[PDB]
Amino acid sequence: DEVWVVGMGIVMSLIVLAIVFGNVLVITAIAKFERLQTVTNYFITSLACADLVMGLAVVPFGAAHILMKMWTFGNFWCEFWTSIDVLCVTASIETLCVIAVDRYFAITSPFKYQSLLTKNKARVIILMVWIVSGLTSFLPIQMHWYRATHQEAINCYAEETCCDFFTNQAYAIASSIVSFYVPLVIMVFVYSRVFQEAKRQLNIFEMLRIDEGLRLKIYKDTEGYYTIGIGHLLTKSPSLNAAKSELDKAIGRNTNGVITKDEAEKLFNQDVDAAVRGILRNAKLKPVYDSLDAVRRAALINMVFQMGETGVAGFTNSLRMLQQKRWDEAAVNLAKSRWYNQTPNRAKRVITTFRTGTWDAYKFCLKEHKALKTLGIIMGTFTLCWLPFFIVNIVHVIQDNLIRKEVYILLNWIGYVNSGFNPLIYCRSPDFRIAFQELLCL
Ligand SMILES: CC(C)CCC[C@@H](C)[C@H]1CC[C@H]2[C@@H]3CC=C4C[C@@H](O)CC[C@]4(C)[C@H]3CC[C@]12C
Ligand SMILES: CC(C)CCC[C@@H](C)[C@H]1CC[C@H]2[C@@H]3CC=C4C[C@@H](O)CC[C@]4(C)[C@H]3CC[C@]12C
Ligand SMILES: CC(C)CCC[C@@H](C)[C@H]1CC[C@H]2[C@@H]3CC=C4C[C@@H](O)CC[C@]4(C)[C@H]3CC[C@]12C
Ligand SMILES: OC[C@H]1O[C@H](O[C@H]2[C@H](O)[C@@H](O)[C@H](O)O[C@@H]2CO)[C@H](O)[C@@H](O)[C@@H]1O
Numbered sequence: 350d351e352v353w354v355v356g357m358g359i360v361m362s363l364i365v366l367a368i369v370f371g372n373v374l375v376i377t378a379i380a381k382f383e384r385l386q387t388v389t390n391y392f393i394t395s396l397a398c399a400d401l402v403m404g405l406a407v408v409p410f411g412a413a414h415i416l417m418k419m420w421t422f423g424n425f426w427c428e429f430w431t432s433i434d435v436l437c438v439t440a441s442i443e444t445l446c447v448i449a450v451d452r453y454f455a456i457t458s459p460f461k462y463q464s465l466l467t468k469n470k471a472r473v474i475i476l477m478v479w480i481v482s483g484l485t486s487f488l489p490i491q492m493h494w495y496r497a498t499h500q501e502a503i504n505c506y507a508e509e510t511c512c513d514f515f516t517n518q519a520y521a522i523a524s525s526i527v528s529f530y531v532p533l534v535i536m537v538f539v540y541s542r543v544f545q546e547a548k549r550q551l552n553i554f555e556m557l558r559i560d561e562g563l564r565l566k567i568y569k570d571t572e573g574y575y576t577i578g579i580g581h582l583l584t585k586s587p588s589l590n591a592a593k594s595e596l597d598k599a600i601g602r603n604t605n606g607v608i609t610k611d612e613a614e615k616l617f618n619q620d621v622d623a624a625v626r627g628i629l630r631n632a633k634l635k636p637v638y639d640s641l642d643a644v645r646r647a648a649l650i651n652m653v654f655q656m657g658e659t660g661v662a663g664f665t666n667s668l669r670m671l672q673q674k675r676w677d678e679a680a681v682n683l684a685k686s687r688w689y690n691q692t693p694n695r696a697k698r699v700i701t702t703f704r705t706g707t708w709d710a711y712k713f714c715l716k717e718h719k720a721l722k723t724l725g726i727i728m729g730t731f732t733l734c735w736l737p738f739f740i741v742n743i744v745h746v747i748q749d750n751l752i753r754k755e756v757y758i759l760l761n762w763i764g765y766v767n768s769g770f771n772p773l774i775y776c777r778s779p780d781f782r783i784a785f786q787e788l789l790c791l
């Protein structure tokens with residue numbers, strides 16, 4: 350009975366520690382490492398501050414309120430504590446919504462993934478988020494717009510040891526819609542469009558960039574030949590200066606061995622053009638290529654890139670089955686090759702692409718697309734943690750007391766606890782992971 354309290358207290362204490370530790374770590378990492386100082390991470394910092402205030406100002410007293418089964422901190426702080434609670438939750442979803450809109454314009458810009466905002470504009474947006482959140486949180490609570498007019502509530506308001514958030518229905522609807530549901534619906538809609546755009550970026554360039562890899566500096570391939578970009582051969586000569594000469598002649602300037610990503614893309618589009626012409630000249634590959642759709646043509650070109658026309662022309666049975674749109678059977682034969690034995694991962698993705706005729710095998714391979722998934726996980730987690738709580742707010746406007754007080758409280762704490770998840774989710778990023786282990790003396 351009472352020993353349970355200590356055990357429950359230690360648990361809630363660890364919850365507080367977890368929230369504060371992790372979010373302090375996030376703030377520190379972004380503030381300290383110049384690498385992490387991006388527009389997105391400024392919003393993340395704003396998001397981390399809301400969670401940090403939750404862990405310091407909100408959760409500790411909510412915990413004590415439950416364990417003591419009454420309020421000990423007085424009416425002033427009860428009203429203040431309540432305001433902070435609503436503020437941090439509001440600012441969090443508003444920030445998440447800003448991230449979604451920011452990421453949409455970033456991914457649709459010709460200046461792709463660059464935020465249209467500068468660092469200074471971002472701070473203004475952030476500051477305006479906290480002003481609006483405070484305007485929608487503190488005002489109604491400090492002006493007493495939220496309060497109900499029935500006696501049970503009136504008693505709780507007046508008595509100093511009662512801190513129950515009794516609200517009138519108009520507030521319950523309006524506040525929950527404006528603070529939560531409006532930025533939630535926008536966030537979900539906009540960031541679903543972000544994923545659509547991200548998926549739409551997948552093409553043969555990204556495919557070969559994932560499968561072969563893009564190298565900005567001159568390197569020797571497996572055969573010892575000088576190569577650059579996505580496996581673009583410069584020369585078979587052992588002279589490095591001969592490669593540099595061919596590179597300059599191809600790119601159109603003094604490169605000294607180094608080219609940009611966009612220039613590698615330029616060379617790649619030429620190599621693709623060359624590959625297709627060669628395919629159409631090959632009597633064994635032409636009928637297959639002619640029959641295939643655009644996506645599977647990219648798959649065939651991918652193979653030609655890796656093995657050359659001759660190596661690909663040797664897949665006589667597979668080519669026949671591909672030509673007849675017998676995908677699974679083509680997949681069975683292709684999986685039984687030296688190709689699949691040497692580069693299974695790459696072969697797995699190309700063969701799967703032959704099977705589906707989509708880019709699904711190349712989802713979330715790019716570092717930038719992985720980063721988008723991380724943000725999507727942040728948003729989804731926040732949604733899942735808070736949605737049940739806010740559904741019950743509306744349900745009780747329809748019919749009050751349908752759901753127990755203890756369940757409603759538990760749904761609140763699922764919301765509270767969410768403030769400790771984001772730091773763990775950021776470990777998906779190689780940059781934060783590197784940042785953290787530096788900060789943690791590793
Ligand atoms: C009234 C009390 C309880 C609420 C606390 C308000 C604090 C947490 C709010 C108010 C203004 C906010 C900030 C506004 C400006 C930015 C700049 C950005 O680069 C990092 C976050 C940062 C610094 C915000 C984080 C937290 C912040 C300081
Ligand atoms: C409001 C009370 C109860 C909670 C304590 C507020 C603390 C957590 C808030 C208030 C102002 C905030 C800061 C405001 C300014 C920034 C600069 C930014 O580059 C890093 C975070 C940093 C340094 C914030 C971190 C935490 C911060 C200090
Ligand atoms: C009243 C309670 C909430 C206060 C507890 C604050 C804890 C979470 C604070 C107090 C001292 C802090 C640490 C102090 C030293 C560093 C090294 C730094 O490179 C990374 C963060 C790190 C590791 C801090 C993280 C969290 C930390 C442990
Ligand atoms: O065979 C056509 C392409 O071959 C090179 O790119 C290959 C390279 O030969 C090989 O060592 C490696 O395993 O794969 C890459 C591509 O994945 C050419 O220099 C390309 O320009 C040709 O199109």
Ligand SMILES: CC(C)NC[C@H](O)COc1cccc2[nH]c3ccccc3c12
Pocket residue numbers: 411431434435436438439514516520521524525528529742761764
């Ligand atoms: C112990 C209570 C005070 N905790 C409140 C929730 O953590 C956050 O609740 C909200 C956040 C944002 C907007 C809100 N509108 C509401 C209407 C009724 C109840 C809560 C909220 C609410």
Ligand SMILES: *C(=O)CCCCCCCCCCCCCCC
Pocket residue numbers: 787788789790
């Ligand atoms: C490498 O960065 C790891 C070493 C950092 C150790 C710093 C020592 C922190 C002491 C924590 C005590 C504060 C507790 C506050 C409780 C209210």
